[PDB]
Each structure stands twice: as structure tokens, then as C-alpha cells.
Design an enzyme around this catalytic site. Structure first.
Site, PDB file in Angstrom:
ATOM      1  N   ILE A  21       0.853  -1.184   0.000  1.00 48.20           N
ATOM      2  CA  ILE A  21       0.000   0.000   0.000  1.00 48.20           C
ATOM      3  C   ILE A  21       0.889   1.235   0.000  1.00 48.20           C
ATOM      4  O   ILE A  21       0.936   1.982  -0.984  1.00 48.20           O
ATOM      5  CB  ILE A  21      -0.958   0.021   1.205  1.00 48.20           C
ATOM      6  CG1 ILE A  21      -1.890  -1.192   1.170  1.00 48.20           C
ATOM      7  CG2 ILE A  21      -1.777   1.318   1.211  1.00 48.20           C
ATOM      8  CD1 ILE A  21      -2.758  -1.336   2.409  1.00 48.20           C
ATOM      9  N   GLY A  22       1.595   1.460   1.108  1.00 45.06           N
ATOM     10  CA  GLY A  22       2.443   2.627   1.237  1.00 45.06           C
ATOM     11  C   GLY A  22       3.615   2.351   2.151  1.00 45.06           C
ATOM     12  O   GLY A  22       3.709   1.297   2.785  1.00 45.06           O
ATOM     13  N   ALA A  25       8.164   6.881   7.019  1.00 43.38           N
ATOM     14  CA  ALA A  25       9.519   7.236   7.415  1.00 43.38           C
ATOM     15  C   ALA A  25      10.204   6.126   8.200  1.00 43.38           C
ATOM     16  O   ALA A  25      11.437   6.129   8.305  1.00 43.38           O
ATOM     17  CB  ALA A  25       9.505   8.520   8.245  1.00 43.38           C
ATOM     18  N   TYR A  26       9.443   5.181   8.753  1.00 41.99           N
ATOM     19  CA  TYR A  26      10.031   4.105   9.542  1.00 41.99           C
ATOM     20  C   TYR A  26       9.117   2.886   9.588  1.00 41.99           C
ATOM     21  O   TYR A  26       9.145   2.121  10.558  1.00 41.99           O
ATOM     22  CB  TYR A  26      10.336   4.593  10.962  1.00 41.99           C
ATOM     23  CG  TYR A  26       9.114   4.978  11.771  1.00 41.99           C
ATOM     24  CD1 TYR A  26       8.672   4.180  12.817  1.00 41.99           C
ATOM     25  CD2 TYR A  26       8.407   6.140  11.490  1.00 41.99           C
ATOM     26  CE1 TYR A  26       7.561   4.529  13.563  1.00 41.99           C
ATOM     27  CE2 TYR A  26       7.291   6.495  12.230  1.00 41.99           C
ATOM     28  CZ  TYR A  26       6.873   5.684  13.266  1.00 41.99           C
ATOM     29  OH  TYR A  26       5.766   6.026  14.009  1.00 41.99           O
ATOM     30  N   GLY A  27       8.313   2.689   8.549  1.00 41.07           N
ATOM     31  CA  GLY A  27       7.422   1.545   8.512  1.00 41.07           C
ATOM     32  C   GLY A  27       6.826   1.369   7.134  1.00 41.07           C
ATOM     33  O   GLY A  27       7.034   2.182   6.230  1.00 41.07           O
ATOM     34  N   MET A  28       6.075   0.279   6.988  1.00 40.56           N
ATOM     35  CA  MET A  28       5.399  -0.052   5.744  1.00 40.56           C
ATOM     36  C   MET A  28       4.024  -0.616   6.069  1.00 40.56           C
ATOM     37  O   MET A  28       3.844  -1.306   7.075  1.00 40.56           O
ATOM     38  CB  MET A  28       6.205  -1.067   4.920  1.00 40.56           C
ATOM     39  CG  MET A  28       5.535  -1.494   3.621  1.00 40.56           C
ATOM     40  SD  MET A  28       6.458  -2.768   2.738  1.00 40.56           S
ATOM     41  CE  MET A  28       7.948  -1.874   2.306  1.00 40.56           C
ATOM     42  N   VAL A  29       3.056  -0.318   5.206  1.00 39.33           N
ATOM     43  CA  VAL A  29       1.684  -0.779   5.370  1.00 39.33           C
ATOM     44  C   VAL A  29       1.324  -1.646   4.173  1.00 39.33           C
ATOM     45  O   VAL A  29       1.584  -1.266   3.025  1.00 39.33           O
ATOM     46  CB  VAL A  29       0.698   0.397   5.511  1.00 39.33           C
ATOM     47  CG1 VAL A  29      -0.717  -0.118   5.747  1.00 39.33           C
ATOM     48  CG2 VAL A  29       1.125   1.316   6.645  1.00 39.33           C
ATOM     49  N   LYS A  44       0.516  -2.482   9.535  1.00 35.56           N
ATOM     50  CA  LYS A  44       1.611  -1.520   9.473  1.00 35.56           C
ATOM     51  C   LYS A  44       2.816  -2.115  10.186  1.00 35.56           C
ATOM     52  O   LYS A  44       2.814  -2.245  11.416  1.00 35.56           O
ATOM     53  CB  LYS A  44       1.215  -0.185  10.103  1.00 35.56           C
ATOM     54  CG  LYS A  44       2.361   0.822  10.148  1.00 35.56           C
ATOM     55  CD  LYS A  44       1.892   2.218  10.523  1.00 35.56           C
ATOM     56  CE  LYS A  44       1.333   2.266  11.934  1.00 35.56           C
ATOM     57  NZ  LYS A  44       1.092   3.663  12.387  1.00 35.56           N
ATOM     58  N   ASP A 139      -1.542  16.586  13.959  1.00 36.10           N
ATOM     59  CA  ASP A 139      -1.020  16.408  12.606  1.00 36.10           C
ATOM     60  C   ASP A 139      -2.151  16.085  11.638  1.00 36.10           C
ATOM     61  O   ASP A 139      -1.974  15.318  10.686  1.00 36.10           O
ATOM     62  CB  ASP A 139       0.048  15.315  12.549  1.00 36.10           C
ATOM     63  CG  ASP A 139       0.987  15.479  11.366  1.00 36.10           C
ATOM     64  OD1 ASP A 139       1.850  14.598  11.162  1.00 36.10           O
ATOM     65  OD2 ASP A 139       0.881  16.499  10.651  1.00 36.10           O
TER      66      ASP A 139
HETATM   67  C1  LIG Z   1       4.445   8.582   5.799  1.00 32.73           C
HETATM   68  C2  LIG Z   1       2.960   8.295   5.587  1.00 32.73           C
HETATM   69  O1  LIG Z   1       2.807   7.141   4.810  1.00 32.73           O
HETATM   70  C3  LIG Z   1       2.831   7.386   3.432  1.00 32.73           C
HETATM   71  O2  LIG Z   1       3.843   7.274   2.828  1.00 32.73           O
HETATM   72  C4  LIG Z   1       1.551   7.796   2.709  1.00 32.73           C
HETATM   73  N1  LIG Z   1       0.436   7.016   3.216  1.00 32.73           N
HETATM   74  C5  LIG Z   1       0.082   5.985   2.256  1.00 32.73           C
HETATM   75  C6  LIG Z   1      -0.982   5.075   2.865  1.00 32.73           C
HETATM   76  C7  LIG Z   1      -2.307   5.234   2.499  1.00 32.73           C
HETATM   77  C8  LIG Z   1      -3.278   4.418   3.047  1.00 32.73           C
HETATM   78  C9  LIG Z   1      -2.932   3.443   3.967  1.00 32.73           C
HETATM   79  C10 LIG Z   1      -4.038   2.558   4.542  1.00 32.73           C
HETATM   80  C11 LIG Z   1      -5.015   1.981   3.783  1.00 32.73           C
HETATM   81  N2  LIG Z   1      -5.811   1.289   4.585  1.00 32.73           N
HETATM   82  N3  LIG Z   1      -5.338   1.426   5.880  1.00 32.73           N
HETATM   83  C12 LIG Z   1      -4.262   2.207   5.849  1.00 32.73           C
HETATM   84  C13 LIG Z   1      -3.455   2.576   7.092  1.00 32.73           C
HETATM   85  C14 LIG Z   1      -3.405   1.814   8.233  1.00 32.73           C
HETATM   86  N4  LIG Z   1      -2.603   2.438   9.125  1.00 32.73           N
HETATM   87  C15 LIG Z   1      -2.157   3.581   8.553  1.00 32.73           C
HETATM   88  C16 LIG Z   1      -1.216   4.588   9.207  1.00 32.73           C
HETATM   89  O3  LIG Z   1      -0.940   4.485  10.355  1.00 32.73           O
HETATM   90  N5  LIG Z   1      -0.656   5.663   8.414  1.00 32.73           N
HETATM   91  C17 LIG Z   1       0.245   6.625   9.018  1.00 32.73           C
HETATM   92  C18 LIG Z   1       0.236   7.903   8.184  1.00 32.73           C
HETATM   93  O4  LIG Z   1      -1.063   8.420   8.138  1.00 32.73           O
HETATM   94  C19 LIG Z   1       1.654   6.039   9.048  1.00 32.73           C
HETATM   95  C20 LIG Z   1       2.490   6.291  10.124  1.00 32.73           C
HETATM   96  C21 LIG Z   1       3.769   5.757  10.147  1.00 32.73           C
HETATM   97  C22 LIG Z   1       4.211   4.972   9.094  1.00 32.73           C
HETATM   98  F1  LIG Z   1       5.472   4.448   9.118  1.00 32.73           F
HETATM   99  C23 LIG Z   1       3.376   4.722   8.019  1.00 32.73           C
HETATM  100 CL1  LIG Z   1       3.941   3.712   6.660  1.00 32.73          CL
HETATM  101  C24 LIG Z   1       2.097   5.254   7.995  1.00 32.73           C
HETATM  102  C25 LIG Z   1      -2.689   3.665   7.290  1.00 32.73           C
HETATM  103  C26 LIG Z   1      -1.605   3.276   4.329  1.00 32.73           C
HETATM  104  C27 LIG Z   1      -0.631   4.098   3.782  1.00 32.73           C
HETATM  105 CL2  LIG Z   1       1.078   3.889   4.258  1.00 32.73          CL
END
Ligand SMILES: CCOC(=O)CNCc1ccc(-c2cn[nH]c2-c2c[nH]c(C(=O)N[C@H](CO)c3ccc(F)c(Cl)c3)c2)cc1Cl
EC number: 2.7.11.24
Length: 347
Positions: A21-22, A25-29, A44, A139
């Protein structure tokens, strides 16, 4: 152990069929299929233990979201990690899966007024619960607002969340700040640490303006430019608002600027609903003490089609950290993270 884009992703046996998905800065989802509930979820992976900052953000989010339960706030339904602190190199948090987010939508989709109204309502409905727990998100922005195919909204990313502390909000002029620049209230650059609920309201105001035109209203390119963008539209602060800023460096900077008139909202947003712009004006008030509060915002006429305070729940008790996480080493934070996640282990 399956992995996604050259990175270990060991969450089985319960969760399988990973899909990227995405990346943060210190993780992957990634999206995975839950073999117990037989539904896909969002997992995540976090790898924060090498930096105190990333550990603080991880722990804050875990503690808060385990205590929160609200339709407009992302949940934590499971946490996977190694059975021992020695073996724990990463942490996997299972959360709601959502098809898109408001950042993506705004890039390509024009939002009808009904959509803008519905989005704003859910944001404020979620924020009401957060603030009722005495918590600040700090944020809020489109990328932290997830949505599904029926446009249900959930607030995510509580890494920068804190307990409100209005008595210790004052600070000097040009004090550094972490949260995303484009959504910082003007007082952040003047005399505020962001420990009051009014900084979340400002961010929501910026999000509303962005939904109206599909572009950020205050796109500052650097720290102080953010303030000059805000003043470019709001105009010069009134004498009353200036007198509330006792810090001389902050006040004298504002006094050194040429007089700038208020840009009327109806000129910036010629197609917006008139009630939407009235509520926008109240959320983007320069003086944080005059800025509208979340419950007041939910009662604004613009949201009359949805307003129902009996269907806008609050937290059962205020939040309180057991200890200040601002001065703790990354080693001890790993222990606390290990403890907060123990209840999810099979044993
Ligand atoms: C730095 C922010 O991360 C990105 O690069 C842009 N977000 C893309 C995204 C878009 C949607 C989803 C998604 C889709 N379904 N559920 C989720 C989701 C579930 N948990 C989170 C979450 O905690 N996201 C936060 C930022 O809002 C986050 C916080 C820390 C992280 F290391 C990452 Cl990877 C993401 C998102 C996940 C993601 Cl990672």
C-alpha cells in the site's frame, strides 16, 4: 516468511496474501487477508527501535488507539511481534483497511458540496471524541484521513498526539515544530507549543479550504513563510489580537509588517456554500482563544443535515500518560512497547 518489496513481512500464520500500500519514514503498510475473521485488513510494519523519536511516536499511538473506539478513528485490532524483547526487531499493528484517503481524492476528484459537508462532519465527529479524551492529534491533514468506497472517514496516525496542556503552551518566537507545515496554526510560529485543542481546529479549517478548491490554502515553503501565507489572506491582526501576544519578538515582528487587508472568503472560493465559508472563517480565526471549538463547529448551520449530539459520542474518561515520554531512551521505550503489546500474544 513472505516479504513485500525487499523487506521482511512476517505476520503469519493468521495473515496472508500481502499486497503493498504505502511506506512511511520508519514503517510499511500492506493489505493482508485475516484467516480468523476472513476479511482483509491493513497491517503496518514498524521498525522504530533504532531512534528514540520513532519509538515515542509508536508508543503514543499504540496507547491511545487501544483506549479509543470510534467509527471515525482508525483502530488497533491486533499486534504481532516476537515473543521476547530480544527477538523483537519490528512491530506489526493491524488496523482498518480503507480504499483511499483524502490526499489521493483531492489530487484528481472534484468534491461536491454534499461530499465536502459529509467529510467535514465525520472529521469533526471523530475530533469531538479525541478532544473529549483530552487528547490532541496535532497532525491532521488529508493524508491522515482515510476513506472507503462509501466515503466513510477514519482519522489515522496518532504519532504526534499528546494530552492537552494549555497551562504550558506558551513559548518564544520562531520555536521549532514537527507537525506538517501547511496545516500549522499561526500561533505556532509566534508563541505556541501546540498544547491546546485550538491547533487541531486550525488544521481542520485548512482541510476544509483545501476541499473547496483542491489545493492547500497556506502552502508555505519554509518555516516563517507559513505565517506570511496565513497573514496574506487573514490580513493584519487587530490590535486586540496583537495584545494577546505578550512576547515582544513575536509582537514586534507582526508590527513590522505592512498593513494587509483581509481577503474575503467568497473571492477565494467563489463556488463554495455560504454557510461553509462562515464556518471556515470561524475555524481559521487568527486568535486561538476566539477560534471555534469542535462541539461548536458540529452545531454550525452548515452541518445541520448531520448534527445530532446524541449520536456523537465522547470518551468514557480522559486520557493520561503513566509517564512523560519526552525524555526516555530508546531502550526503555522498547520495553514499554513490549508491555503494551503483551495482551495480543497467543499466550
Ligand atoms: C508517511 C505516511 O505514509 C505514506 O507514505 C503515505 N500514506 C500511504 C498510505 C495510504 C493508506 C494506507 C491505509 C489503507 N488502509 N489502511 C491504511 C493505514 C493503516 N494504518 C495507517 C497509518 O498508520 N498511516 C500513518 C500515516 O497516516 C503512518 C504512520 C507511520 C508509518 F510508518 C506509516 Cl507507513 C504510515 C494507514 C496506508 C498508507 Cl502507508
Amino acid at each position: 516468511p513472505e516479504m513485500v518489496r525487499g523487506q521482511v513481512f512476517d505476520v503469519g500464520p493468521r495473515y496472508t496474501n500481502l499486497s503493498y500500500i504505502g511506506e512511511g519514514a520508519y514503517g510499511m503498510v500492506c493489505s493482508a487477508y485475516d484467516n480468523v475473521n476472513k476479511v482483509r485488513v491493513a497491517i503496518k510494519k514498524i521498525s522504530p527501535f533504532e531512534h528514540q523519536t520513532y519509538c515515542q511516536r509508536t508508543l503514543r499511538e499504540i496507547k491511545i488507539l487501544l483506549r479509543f473506539r470510534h467509527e471515525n478513528i482508525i483502530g488497533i485490532n491486533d499486534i504481532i511481534r516476537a515473543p521476547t524483547i530480544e527477538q523483537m526487531k519490528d512491530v506489526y499493528i493491524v488496523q482498518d483497511l480503507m480504499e483511499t484517503d483524502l490526499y489521493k481524492l483531492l489530487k484528481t476528484q472534484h468534491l461536491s458540496n454534499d461530499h465536502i459537508c459529509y467529510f467535514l462532519y465525520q472529521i469533526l465527529r471523530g475530533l469531538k471524541y479525541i478532544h473529549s479524551a483530552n487528547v490532541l492529534h496535532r497532525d491532521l491533514k488529508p493524508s491522515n484521513l482515510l476513506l472507503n468506497t462509501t466515503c466513510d472517514l477514519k482519522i489515522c496516525d496518532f504519532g504526534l498526539a499528546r494530552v492537552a496542556d494549555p497551562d504550558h503552551d506558551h513559548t518564544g518566537f520562531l520555536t521549532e515544530y514537527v507537525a506538517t507545515r501547511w496545516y500549522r496554526a499561526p500561533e505556532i510560529m509566534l508563541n505556541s507549543k501546540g498544547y491546546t485543542k485550538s491547533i487541531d481546529i486550525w488544521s481542520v479549517g485548512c482541510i476544509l479550504a483545501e476541499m473547496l478548491s483542491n489545493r492547500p490554502i497556506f502552502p508555505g515553503k519554509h518555516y516563517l513563510d507559513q505565517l506570511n501565507h496565513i497573514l496574506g489572506i487573514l490580513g493584519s491582526p487587530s490590535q486586540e489580537d496583537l495584545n494577546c501576544i505578550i512576547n515582544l519578538k513575536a509582537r514586534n515582528y507582526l508590527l513590522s509588517l505592512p498593513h494587509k487587508n483581509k481577503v474575503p472568503w467568497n473571492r477565494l472560493f467563489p463556488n463554495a456554500d455560504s454557510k461553509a465559508l462562515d464556518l471556515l472563517d470561524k475555524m481559521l480565526t487568527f486568535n486561538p482563544h476566539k477560534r471555534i471549538e469542535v462541539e461548536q463547529a458540529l452545531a454550525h448551520p452548515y452541518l445541520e443535515q448531520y448534527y445530532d449530539p446524541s449520536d456523537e459520542p465522547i470518551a468514557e474518561a480522559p486520557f493520561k500518560f503513566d509517564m512523560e515520554l519526552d525524555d526516555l531512551p530508546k531502550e526503555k521505550l522498547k520495553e514499554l512497547i513490549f508491555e503494551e503489546t503483551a495482551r495480543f500474544q497467543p499466550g
